[PDB]
Amino acid sequence: RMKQLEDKAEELLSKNYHLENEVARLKKLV
Amino acid sequence: RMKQLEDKAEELLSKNYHLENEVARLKKLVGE
C-alpha cells in the first residue's frame, strides 16, 4: 500500500505538470 | 507515512481539478 500511494502521488504530479503546460499553451494562444 | 502520502494525493487531486477547470475555461476562449 505504501508503494501504491507513492505511485499515485507521482502519477498525479505528472498530470499536474501536464495541466500546467496546457495552461501555458492556452495562455500563449490568447 | 500512510497519512502523509494520503494527504499528498488529496492535495494533488484538488490542484488537478482546479487546473482542469482553468484549462476548460481557456479552451473555450481560444475555441478548442
UniProtKB/Swiss-Prot annotation, chain A:
Residues 5-26 are annotated as: Leucine-zipper. Phosphorylated by the cyclin-CDK PCL5-PHO85. Disruption phenotype: Abolishes recruitment of the mediator complex to the upstream activating sequence (UAS) of amino-acid starvation responsive genes. Decreases RNA level of genes involved in amino acid biosynthesis and cofactor biosynthesis during amino acid starvation or methyl methanesulfonate stress. Growth dependent on amino acid supplementation. Sensitive to amino acid starvation. Sensitive to purine starvation. Decreases cellular glycogen levels during glucose starvation. It comes from the Eukaryota. It is found in: Nucleus. Induction: Translation is induced by amino acid or purine starvation, or during growth in low or poor carbon sources. Translational repression during nutrient-rich conditions is dependent on four uORFs (upstream open reading frames) present in the 5'-UTR of the mRNA; these promote ribosome dissociation. Translational induction occurs in conditions reducing translation machinery efficiency, leading to ribosomes scanning over the uORFs, and increased translation of the mRNA. The rapid translational induction is followed by transcriptional induction at later time-points, independently of the uORF sequences. Belongs to the bZIP family. GCN4 subfamily. Residues 89 to 100 and 106 to 125 define the N-terminal activation domain (NTAD) and the central acidic activation domain (CAAD) respectively, which can function independently to promote high-level transcription of the target genes. Master transcriptional regulator that mediates the response to amino acid starvation. Binds variations of the DNA sequence 5'-ATGA[CG]TCAT-3' in canonical nucleosome-depleted 5'-positioned promoters, and also within coding sequences and 3' non-coding regions. During nutrient starvation (low or poor amino acid, carbon or purine sources), it activates genes required for amino acid biosynthesis and transport, autophagy, cofactor biosynthesis and transport, mitochondrial transport, and additional downstream transcription factors. Homodimer. Each subunit binds overlapping and non-identical half-sites that flank the central CG base-pair in the pseudo-palindromic motif 5'-ATGA[CG]TCAT-3'. Interacts with the mediator tail; the interaction with GAL11/MED15 is direct. Interacts with the SAGA histone acetyltransferase complex. Interacts with the SWI/SNF chromatin remodeling complex. This is General control transcription factor GCN4. It comes from Saccharomyces cerevisiae (strain ATCC 204508 / S288c). The chain holds residues 249 to 278 of 281 of the full protein.
Swiss-Prot record, chain B:
Disruption phenotype: Abolishes recruitment of the mediator complex to the upstream activating sequence (UAS) of amino-acid starvation responsive genes. Decreases RNA level of genes involved in amino acid biosynthesis and cofactor biosynthesis during amino acid starvation or methyl methanesulfonate stress. Growth dependent on amino acid supplementation. Sensitive to amino acid starvation. Sensitive to purine starvation. Decreases cellular glycogen levels during glucose starvation. The gene is GCN4. The lineage of its organism: Eukaryota, Fungi, Dikarya, Ascomycota, Saccharomycotina. It is found in: Nucleus. Residues 89 to 100 and 106 to 125 define the N-terminal activation domain (NTAD) and the central acidic activation domain (CAAD) respectively, which can function independently to promote high-level transcription of the target genes. Phosphorylated by the cyclin-CDK PCL5-PHO85. The chain holds residues 249 to 280 of 281 of the full protein. Master transcriptional regulator that mediates the response to amino acid starvation. Binds variations of the DNA sequence 5'-ATGA[CG]TCAT-3' in canonical nucleosome-depleted 5'-positioned promoters, and also within coding sequences and 3' non-coding regions. During nutrient starvation (low or poor amino acid, carbon or purine sources), it activates genes required for amino acid biosynthesis and transport, autophagy, cofactor biosynthesis and transport, mitochondrial transport, and additional downstream transcription factors. Homodimer. Each subunit binds overlapping and non-identical half-sites that flank the central CG base-pair in the pseudo-palindromic motif 5'-ATGA[CG]TCAT-3'. Interacts with the mediator tail; the interaction with GAL11/MED15 is direct. Interacts with the SAGA histone acetyltransferase complex. Interacts with the SWI/SNF chromatin remodeling complex. Residues 5-26 are annotated as: Leucine-zipper. Induction: Translation is induced by amino acid or purine starvation, or during growth in low or poor carbon sources. Translational repression during nutrient-rich conditions is dependent on four uORFs (upstream open reading frames) present in the 5'-UTR of the mRNA; these promote ribosome dissociation. Translational induction occurs in conditions reducing translation machinery efficiency, leading to ribosomes scanning over the uORFs, and increased translation of the mRNA. The rapid translational induction is followed by transcriptional induction at later time-points, independently of the uORF sequences. This is General control transcription factor GCN4. Belongs to the bZIP family. GCN4 subfamily.
